[PDB]
Design a protein around this ligand. Structure first.
Ligand SMILES: O=c1c(-c2ccc(O)cc2)coc2cc(O)cc(O)c12
Ligand SMILES: O=c1c(-c2ccc(O)cc2)coc2cc(O)cc(O)c12
Lengths: 10, 225, 225, 10
C-alpha cells in the first residue's frame, strides 16, 4: 500500500 | 489552459535528479542489480509526486490513479533513462553515479538483451533529435494511455497532453507534412519503449523470485501489482 | 509510388477471409483453443503473402523480414480481428462462422481477460470510427514498426506508409489541427493492441505447456520465434 | 524453416 499513501499525502 | 502552459506545468512536475550515493567503481553482478533496483525504488517515489503535479491527475478516482501508475511505471522510468542518455551515445545514464555500457551488462544473464534495446531506441530518439518539451509530453502520454465520470476525465486529460505535443511540434517551424511525419515517428517509438519495458520487468520478476536483489517495499509492490 | 498508389496496393493485398467452422457442440476449453489455433495457423500463411506485397518489404534482407514477422504476427492478427468486429459491439468476429460472444471466453482459463481488452480496444476504434483505408495503413505500420543499409531502408518504408496514412486522413477533409489530432489518436492505440498481443502470446505459450492443445509447425515456430 | 520457406519458396 506504499503507492496509495504517497498518492494521498504530500 | 493553453498547450504552452500545460507543457509548462509538466516542466514543473519534473522530478529532481536522483543519485544512488555510490562511489565510482567497477560493477559486479550483485552491485549492478542492487544499484538498478535501489535507483528504481527512489525514482518511483518521485514519479508519484510527478504524476500528481499533472493537471487533473488527482481528480481521477483513486482506482484509476493506481491502475495507471502500476501499469506504466517501468516504461516511464525507461523513457527518462533514454532522455538522460540522448547526448551520451553508447551509454545508459541511469543516474550520474550509475553510467553503464553495453559490455558491462554482460555479467548479468539476459540483461544484455535489454541494454541493446534501450540503446537502439535511445539512438533512434537521438537521430530524430528529440526535444525536451517533446519528451515532457510523451512521458505524460505514456502514463495517461496505459488504461488496459473518471473515464471522461482521463480521455480529456490524454487529449490535452496530445494537444500539447502537437503544439510543440508546430513551434519547431517545419513543414506541415514534416510535422505529421515527426508526430507519427515519435509516437511509434513508444511501442519500442513499451517492449523494452515488458522485457525489463520480466527480467526483474525473475530476479525477485530468486531473491538475488533486495526488492525494496515500493519497488516490490509496483512489481507484484 | 504516391500515397494513393500505396493505399490501393495495400487494399488489393488484403488477405481473403479464412473460413473456419464453429464446433458442433458448445465450446470447451480444448475445442476453443483448437479453433483459435487452427485459425491462426491458416491466417499466418495469408499474412506471409500479404507482407510480400507491402512495397519494398521483399527488398529487405531475409533476416529483417523474419524478425519483423516473428515480432508482430499476433498484433497483426488481432488488429485484423478488431477491424472485422468494428460493427458488432460485444462480439468478436474471428471468422465468418466463428462469432465468439464475450461470455463464451469463460470456458478457457484466463482468456476472458484478453477478450475484454480486445473488445475495449475495438470499441475505441469504433468510437474513433476508424475507416478502411486508415486501417490498411495502420496494419502495415504495425509490421514495419516492429523493428523490435537495410535497417535504413526499413525506416524509409515506414515513412511511406505513414505518409499514406497522413494522406488518407487529409482526404477526410477535417482541419489541419484535427488531422494531427486524429493521427495521434490512431497511433496511441497501437500500444493497446500490442498489450493484447503480449497477453495473447503469453496465454498461448501457457496453454501449450499445459498440453491444453497442440501447437506445432508454423504456429509453434512463430510462438518461440 | 516453415516461415523461411513461405517467405522464399512461396
Ligand atoms: O532497467 C532496469 C531498471 C531501471 C532503473 C532506473 C531507470 O531510470 C530505468 C530502468 C531497474 O531495474 C531493472 C532490473 C532488471 O532485472 C532489468 C532491468 O533492465 C532493470
Ligand atoms: O486471440 C487469439 C488468437 C487469434 C486468432 C485469429 C485472429 O484473427 C486473431 C487472434 C489466436 O490464438 C490465441 C491463443 C490464446 O491462448 C489466446 C488468444 O487471445 C488467442
Amino acid at each position: 500500500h506504499k503507492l496509495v499513501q504517497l498518492l494521498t499525502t504530500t | 489552459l493553453s498547450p504552452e502552459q500545460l507543457v509548462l506545468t509538466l516542466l514543473e512536475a519534473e522530478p529532481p535528479h536522483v543519485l544512488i550515493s555510490r562511489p565510482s567503481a567497477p560493477f559486479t553482478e550483485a552491485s549492478m542489480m542492487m544499484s538498478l533496483t535501489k535507483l528504481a525504488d527512489k525514482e518511483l517515489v518521485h514519479m508519484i509526486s510527478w504524476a500528481k503535479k499533472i493537471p487533473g491527475f488527482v481528480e481521477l478516482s483513486l482506482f484509476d490513479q493506481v491502475r495507471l501508475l502500476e501499469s506504466c511505471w517501468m516504461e516511464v522510468l525507461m523513457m527518462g533513462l533514454m532522455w538522460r542518455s540522448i547526448d551520451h551515445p553508447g551509454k545508459l545514464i541511469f543516474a550520474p553515479d550509475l553510467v553503464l555500457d553495453r559490455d558491462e551488462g554482460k555479467c548479468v544473464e539476459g540483461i544484455l538483451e535489454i541494454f541493446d534495446m534501450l540503446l537502439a531506441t535511445t539512438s533512434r530518439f537521438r537521430e530524430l533529435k528529440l526535444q525536451h518539451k517533446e519528451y515532457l509530453c510523451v512521458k505524460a502520454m505514456i502514463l495517461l494511455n496505459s488504461s488496459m465520470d473518471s473515464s471522461r476525465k482521463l480521455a480529456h486529460l490524454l487529449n490535452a497532453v496530445t494537444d500539447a505535443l502537437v503544439w510543440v511540434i508546430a513551434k519547431s517551424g517545419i513543414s506541415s507534412q514534416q510535422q505529421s511525419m515527426r508526430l507519427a515517428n515519435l509516437l511509434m517509438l513508444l511501442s519500442h519503449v513499451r517492449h523494452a519495458s515488458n522485457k525489463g520487468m520480466e527480467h526483474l520478476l525473475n530476479m525477485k523470485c530468486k531473491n538475488v536483489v533486495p526488492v525494496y517495499d515500493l519497488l516490490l509492490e509496483m512489481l507484484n501489482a
